[PDB]
Design a protein around this ligand. Structure first.
Ligand SMILES: *[C@@H]1O[C@H](CO)[C@@H](O)[C@H](O)[C@H]1NC(C)=O
Ligand SMILES: *[C@@H]1O[C@H](CO)[C@@H](O)[C@H](O)[C@H]1NC(C)=O
Lengths: 495, 72, 127, 109, 72, 49, 50, 49, 72
């Protein structure tokens, strides 16, 4: 519920010692957390937001040249000069022409020449930047209350949201019923601002990093304009033509907007038409759920006569979702729900919406289950009206495990070392695992930086060839430690 | 110009689709093939130089694909 | 707790433009869509509907695509209805219709329910 | 692009009435976005049904709906005197627009 | 985009100056130079992989400068 | 003296009348009336429902 | 699949890659046929009008 | 009980409004006003002139 | 056209009779035997080519049946 039908769910099992679990959660996915004797909750980061932006440097896109003046001089008599040349709002470049008696000069040589133009901008690109504080996240918290119209209905009163700020980052959620959940984020070690420039076009907005933003050949001016008129690298957007070694001329270059849209190939788009709402990134959030009860214990098993008002209809990575309607007596009650089979009776199939509860009897309650990899049966009622429904699930035996492995390597490729903080404190293995992933990531960094889609594939096959044709059993280390990994990363980049 | 250095391999990757993937994901692989099939003689002569410079076949194919890649 | 009041009009003339408004109370304005529904006397309830949001990106109608535009403002929490080029059949009872926006700011799909609460209706006439 | 629920139906108090509504494969034949309304003649139309079988808070369990492809049927079991009002259907098209029904006038006496 | 294929080797060059002679003759080398000064470790790794292949010095230097010039 | 044009390219465009349409899974493709006229630019993609 | 008055029960992937001018299932006003070139041909016999 | 059509293949058709347009050599290829619709099936080919 | 891709191996077979069995079951052989009686020279040439390549005696029959079978 609020997690159903989103194609990225990432079920989190169990809890370790004191009742806390460690999850990383991002904008694309939403996390379903299952515990032993605790309700299952659904977590979803919905809104990253920068709050106080301060502009760093603004580029120009389309400019305009007026007041073109020029000045030449005799060939041996040095170099020309203008008082417009020392003005910073004029662009100049020395060259030379041919001079003689036809040019009214004498001495028949190559005289110098200057040319000016008043560089005037009319389309800016304000690159704003923010600090890691006042960066206010927002996470919705929602339980698996078996409750009408709530499975994917991502609106309304179907959950409680809390907001995370890096100077006050506990802010527990008193969600109705079920007790009260706490969580301990770490948003400072997330996307790592002070290295991120919120670039801004007229209406569109991007999210680029600093050193790319500072190295663009395009005329610039600092964050305070105040009759700016002092564009710095003006030569990148004018060009001076000297045809035939006769007179020379100055022309502007034109609109750099579409070339800038080609420049941003690999920049995640955000919006800042109102606010500075990012919709990308993640944060490592330690979910600490101590005082989280069930809302429905000490109820009684039902009398019977359930009926189904919406069919089985399994989700992706199949977990079925059935909506049932109760009629009868004893209206607060526990639904006798169980996934099992035919004769020589066993039980097989986990229940995800733990302890489903009928309240306010004339209101349907939607239960979600988890069937096994073959054929199974769905039993709901008890003595009369034994609601027995069939369901068949394709494959789900080895394709589930290799699909879990591919989600694990993809989650470990998109997120860095933080993907090791997705489990419930493995102790030594998680810590040395992310320690070796920090060392191997820092050595994988300061390499493959600026390398694109095809180039790390090419360097991957030319390092895998060296891996195959080596000696001294350096084969496996140079093959599987760097080679095949850079192949896989070469495939999975450019999301 | 500004439409080069296209901000590609600079970290910062997420699950969200970027500004141009499936448009800029294959632009070099299309303009290289267009450039080859409208300028073949440099590819033949680059195969001649790559067959000349290089002892084993791996570095001959490597020098061939790099010399084909460096040309616009 | 959720109340939606409106502003009525007495009588209009064909060739003019009418501007009916509506105040939203009991809930915030930034994450809620607010549609528009006709009701001609003894006829089908036609759809003026405007998918407003906190940003203002709004789809037109289909029968009335190039005939009517609207405005809005957040500080007054009022969605307007500027029906231009009035005709003889444009007399109806206009309703404002509460609707809920997705939590990602955009309005791609509407919710499972549409119209939990309504305006009282403004019976406009032409003459 | 319009719904075709009939003109008027009637039934004695104690019986059950059925109100049907047929549409295109772009709003009712594929999607579950079907809802119902209670337009009293001196009141704004009140929301009596959510999604095809669902129901708002405050609406009694007397009302129930179904869908059999291109046809969405509304069933009122055990009519009373407080049902003498119009009933308008609704559907969200795949295009992005909403269409309403013609209107059924219900009488019990 | 269209800002690639920069109309360089096409014949047609006369005694007259072109559109960006002396402003396009060195933008490639300046772009590669600032790329190396912003991204050193790929040039270190290009030296390492250039050294292990190429059983003579000439194709080690050749594969080094080509692997440098392919990446932007 | 007398030039004849060969091919006209666009440089700066704009997109008005943004319309979209989606349909439930495992039942074909969406159909839309503006796909017929070729002023409109189109693309098919996959949402999850 | 349903022709004129008969009917058959075919494989799905066989049905989708069937070379004929097709149209989506939710398509009213069936004018925008898609691969129309599989039911027309262009006679350019000599180098003259086609 | 309730089927959902996913694709409509056609069997028999007909072609009306057959129009053509040519253009002198090396000055590009023609353009016709009803090429803008996707009802009109089109093909470009070379004639000698 | 759709006279090919004849929906012949899609699984899907039940106990009841298909659309045209006992016509479609042998029409492939009655079409491949008419072609040989109308074109014997390709059968002779495929016999010579089939005897030439394919050293061992089973490959003569395999390459011969495949050569006379892939040509309709
Ligand atoms: C495009 O938009 C304008 C203004 O909204 C409208 O008048 C016109 O009919 C639209 N074009 C089409 C093909 O619908
Ligand atoms: C095709 O020709 C007929 C006969 O003149 C005409 O009525 C029709 O409008 C034409 N079709 C189009 C698209 O113009």
């Amino acid at each position: 519920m609020r997690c159903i039908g989103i194609s990225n769910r990432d079920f989190v099992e169990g809890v370790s010692g004191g009742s806390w679990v460690d999850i990383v959660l991002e904008h694309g996915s939403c996390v379903t957390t299952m515990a032993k004797n605790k309700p299952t909750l659904d977590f979803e980061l919905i809104e990253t937001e920068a709050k106080q932006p301060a502009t760093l440097r603004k580029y120009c896109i389309e400019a305009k040249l007026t007041n073109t003046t020029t000045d030449s001089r005799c060939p041996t008599q040095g170099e020309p000069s203008l008082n417009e040349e020392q003005d910073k709002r004029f662009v100049c470049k020395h060259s030379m022409v041919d001079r003689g008696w036809g040019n009214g000069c004498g001495l028949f040589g190559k005289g110098g020449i200057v040319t000016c133009a008043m560089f005037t901008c009319k389309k800016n690109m304000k690159g704003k930047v923010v600090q890691p504080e006042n960066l206010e996240y927002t996470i919705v918290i929602t339980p698996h209350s078996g409750e009408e119209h709530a499975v994917g209905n991502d609106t309304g009163k179907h959950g409680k949201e809390i907001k995370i700020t890096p100077q006050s980052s506990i802010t527990e959620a008193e969600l109705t019923g079920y007790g009260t959940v706490t969580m301990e984020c770490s948003p400072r070690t997330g996307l790592d601002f002070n290295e991120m420039v919120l670039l801004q076009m007229e209406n569109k907005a991007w999210l680029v990093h600093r050193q790319w933003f500072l190295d663009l050949p395009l005329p610039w001016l600092p964050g305070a304009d105040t009759q700016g008129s002092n564009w710095i690298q003006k030569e990148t957007l004018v060009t001076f033509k000297n045809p035939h070694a006769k007179k020379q001329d100055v022309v502007v270059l034109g609109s750099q907007e579409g070339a800038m849209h080609t420049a941003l190939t690999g920049a995640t788009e955000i919006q800042m038409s109102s606010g500075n709402l990012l919709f990308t990134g993640h944060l490592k959030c330690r979910l600490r759920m101590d005082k989280l009860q069930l809302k429905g214990m000490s109820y009684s098993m039902c009398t019977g006569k359930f009926k189904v008002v919406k069919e089985i209809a399994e989700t992706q990575h199949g977990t079925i979702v059935i909506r049932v309607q109760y009629e009868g007596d004893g209206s607060p009650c526990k639904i006798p729900f169980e996934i099992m089979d035919l004769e020589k009776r066993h039980v097989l199939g986990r229940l995800i919406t733990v302890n489903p509860i009928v309240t306010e009897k004339d209101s349907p309650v939607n239960i979600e289950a988890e069937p096994p990899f073959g054929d199974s049966y769905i039993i709901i009622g008890v003595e009369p009206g034994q609601l027995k429904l069939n369901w068949f699930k394709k494959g789900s035996s080895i394709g589930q495990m290799i699909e879990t492995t591919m989600r694990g390597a993809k989650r470990m490729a998109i997120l860095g070392d933080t993907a090791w903080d997705f489990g419930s404190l493995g102790g030594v293995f998680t810590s040395i695992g992310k320690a070796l992933h920090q060392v191997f990531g820092a050595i994988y960094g300061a390499a493959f930086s600026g390398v694109s889609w095809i180039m790390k594939i090419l360097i991957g096959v030319i390092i895998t060839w060296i891996g195959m044709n080596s000696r001294s059993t350096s084969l496996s280390v140079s093959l599987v430690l760097v080679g095949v990994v850079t192949l896989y990363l070469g495939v999975m980049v450019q999301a | 110009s500004v439409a080069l250095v296209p901000h590609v391999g600079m970290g910062l990757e997420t699950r969200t689709e970027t500004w141009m993937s499936s448009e800029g994901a294959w632009k070099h692989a299309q303009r290289i093939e267009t450039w080859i099939l409208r300028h073949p003689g440099f590819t033949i002569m680059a195969a001649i130089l790559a067959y000349t410079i290089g002892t084993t076949h791996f570095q001959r194919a490597l020098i061939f694909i790099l010399l084909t890649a460096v040309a616009p | 707790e959720v109340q939606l009041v409106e502003s009525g009009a007495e009588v209009k003339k064909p060739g003019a433009s009418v501007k009916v408004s509506c105040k939203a109370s009991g809930y915030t304005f930034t994450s809620y869509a607010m549609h528009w529904v006709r009701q001609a006397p003894g006829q089908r309830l036609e759809w003026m509907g405007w998918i407003n949001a906190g940003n203002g990106n709004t789809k037109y109608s289909q029968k009335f695509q190039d005939r009517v535009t609207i405005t809005r403002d957040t500080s007054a929490s009022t969605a307007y209805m500027e029906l231009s080029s009035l005709r003889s059949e444009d007399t109806a009872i206009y309703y404002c219709a509460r609707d809920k926006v997705d939590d990602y700011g955009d309005y791609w799909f509407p919710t499972l329910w549409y119209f939990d609460y309504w305006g009282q209706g403004t019976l406009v006439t032409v003459s | 692009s319009a719904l075709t629920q009939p003109a008027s139906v009637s039934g004695s108090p104690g019986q059950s009435i059925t109100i049907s509504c047929t549409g295109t494969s772009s709003d009712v034949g594929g999607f579950n976005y079907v809802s119902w309304f209670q337009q009293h003649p001196g009141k704004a139309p009140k929301l009596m049904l959510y999604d095809v079988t669902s129901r708002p808070s405050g609406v009694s369990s007397r009302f129930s709906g179904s869908k059999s492809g291109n046809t969405a049927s509304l069933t009122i079991s055990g009519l009373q005197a407080e049902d003498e009002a119009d009933y308008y259907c609704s559907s969200h098209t795949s295009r992005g627009t909403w269409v309403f029904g013609g209107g059924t006038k219900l009488t019990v006496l």
